[PDB]
Amino acid sequence: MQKTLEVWIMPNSPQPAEDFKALVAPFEKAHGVEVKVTVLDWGVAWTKITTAATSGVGPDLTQLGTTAVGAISAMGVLEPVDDVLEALGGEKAYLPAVWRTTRLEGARQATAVPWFSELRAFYYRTDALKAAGVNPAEMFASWQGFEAGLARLKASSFRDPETKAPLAPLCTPGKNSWDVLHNAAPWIWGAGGEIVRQAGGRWQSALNSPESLEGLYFFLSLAQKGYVPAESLEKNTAQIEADFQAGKCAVFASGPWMIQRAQVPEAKGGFAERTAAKNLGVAPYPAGPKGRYTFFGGSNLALFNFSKNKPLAKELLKYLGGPEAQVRYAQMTGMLPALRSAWSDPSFQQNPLLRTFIQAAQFGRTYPSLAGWGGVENLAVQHLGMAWDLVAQGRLTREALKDLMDKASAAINQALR
Numbered sequence: 001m002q003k004t005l006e007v008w009i010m011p012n013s014p015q016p017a018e019d020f021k022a023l024v025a026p027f028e029k030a031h032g033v034e035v036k037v038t039v040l041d042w043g044v045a046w047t048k049i050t051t052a053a054t055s056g057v058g059p060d061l062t063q064l065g066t067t068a069v070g071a072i073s074a075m076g077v078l079e080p081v082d083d084v085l086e087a088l089g090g091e092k093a094y095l096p097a098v099w100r101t102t103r104l105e106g107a108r109q110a111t112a113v114p115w116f117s118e119l120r121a122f123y124y125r126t127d128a129l130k131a132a133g134v135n136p137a138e139m140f141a142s143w144q145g146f147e148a149g150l151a152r153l154k155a156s157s158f159r160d161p162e163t164k165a166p167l168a169p170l171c172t173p174g175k176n177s178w179d180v181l182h183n184a185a186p187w188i189w190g191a192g193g194e195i196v197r198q199a200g201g202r203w204q205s206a207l208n209s210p211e212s213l214e215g216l217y218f219f220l221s222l223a224q225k226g227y228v229p230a231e232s233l234e235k236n237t238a239q240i241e242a243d244f245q246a247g248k249c250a251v252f253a254s255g256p257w258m259i260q261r262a263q264v265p266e267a268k269g270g271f272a273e274r275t276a277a278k279n280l281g282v283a284p285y286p287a288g289p290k291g292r293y294t295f296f297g298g299s300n301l302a303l304f305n306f307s308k309n310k311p312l313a314k315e316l317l318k319y320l321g322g323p324e325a326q327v328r329y330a331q332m333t334g335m336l337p338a339l340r341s342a343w344s345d346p347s348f349q350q351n352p353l354l355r356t357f358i359q360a361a362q363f364g365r366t367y368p369s370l371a372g373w374g375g376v377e378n379l380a381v382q383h384l385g386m387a388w389d390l391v392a393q394g395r396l397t398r399e400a401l402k403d404l405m406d407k408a409s410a411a412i413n414q415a416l417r
């Protein structure tokens with residue numbers, strides 16, 4: 001007799017199903033319904049979602065990554081959710097970058113409800129910067145400051161108290177990570193570039209624009225100038241997080257989840273005992289030639305238009321999208337709320353590192369919600385990876401980067417036709 005809603009999620013928190021069921025238990029009691037959650041392993045999440053969309057067999061609600069909204073929306077399989085967004089405060093309730101992820105680009109109606117936001121900022125070793133005579137305020141004020149700070153960090157005599165070795169100035173992945181384009185995007189944007197741009201109602205690559213090439217080379221060249229260890233370029237973001245925790249890196253970019261890890265003993269997967277946890281700072285990405293930008297991703301929630309339970313599903317979207325559940329689930333995931341009013345909650349404001357992430361959040365920017373986004377990103381990342389391979393050999397020239405981005409741009413433009 002009790003009605004059920006089926007919800008698909010990805011592994012967003014340490015106990016994905018149990019955490020999600022705790023989160024919705026008050027909703028279940030209030031409506032007299034049961035929520036049946038299925039956790040889609042990141043290895044299979046996108047294929048399961050695509051099959052639901054083509055077969056018309058699947059859950060009531062699914063999590064969608066922000067960059068997937070366009071593709072699933074373009075299939076015509078998602079219920080409009082303008083009513084839910086208006087209930088939560090409408091366009092003004094969201095950072096504009098997050099609002100853009102509610103619909104296919106150009107669409108009249110919203111098809112996704114923002115759930116949580118992934119953003120990246122720079123963690124740094126407060127002990128290392130102090131030793132190097134680098135002030136964070138100045139290092140993160142400008143690209144020129146940022147590179148000058150890395151130069152000072154490379155020259156510094158400072159040794160980690162546990163490793164007994166100097167720190168790498170900057171650690172970053174290259175091509176062997178899920179977030180190759182995301183790591184590049186703030187540098188593209190800060191120079192005045194873009195991955196794709198709309199001209200005359202038509203989307204084309206801008207990776208080979210002068211401004212994109214300026215930002216890309218600024219970032220990639222740090223590794224050829226000695227500021228990034230060759231071994232970092234073999235690794236993914238999770239491995240670079242481990243190197244920072246281990247005291248091997250003065251500066252590296254990640255999300256807000258590292259702050260919770262810094263409070264958790266090493267025996268439970270954290271790094272509380274390590275020098276890095278006791279000497280931890282955060283700064284936003286440095287202001288570039290045209291602007292300061294912070295990468296945003298994360299996930300939204302969508303309702304399949306073949307659902308038999310649309311009213312109750314939209315009540316659950318309002319609950320998950322709304323203030324109380326936004327704060328609770330951002331804490332569980334180590335993410336930031338998608339609902340901007342939640343950024344003022346004391347769970348963010350009481351922690352200095354989370355306050356800096358809130359500062360970084362106001363500069364947020366995301367990719368356009370294109371149906372063809374995955375093709376764009378895939379072709380961009382293949383060519384950026386060839387650029388990272390030249391970096392690893394010290395052979396990335398300006399001209400070599402332009403050749404690779406022209407090749408990427410030709411392939412992207414063909415894909416978008």
Ligand SMILES: OC[C@H]1O[C@@H](OC[C@H]2O[C@@H](O)[C@H](O)[C@@H](O)[C@@H]2O)[C@H](O)[C@@H](O)[C@@H]1O
Pocket residue numbers: 042064065066067068118178296297298299
């Ligand atoms: O798939 C597109 C989707 O990806 C989202 O990130 C997923 C990412 O999460 C990491 O923690 C995990 O280690 C990776 O294996 C996994 O791919 C992203 O934030 C969304 O914006 C994006 O659309």
Ligand SMILES: O=S([O-])[O-]
Pocket residue numbers: 192193194197
């Ligand atoms: O098109 S400009 O805003 O990146």
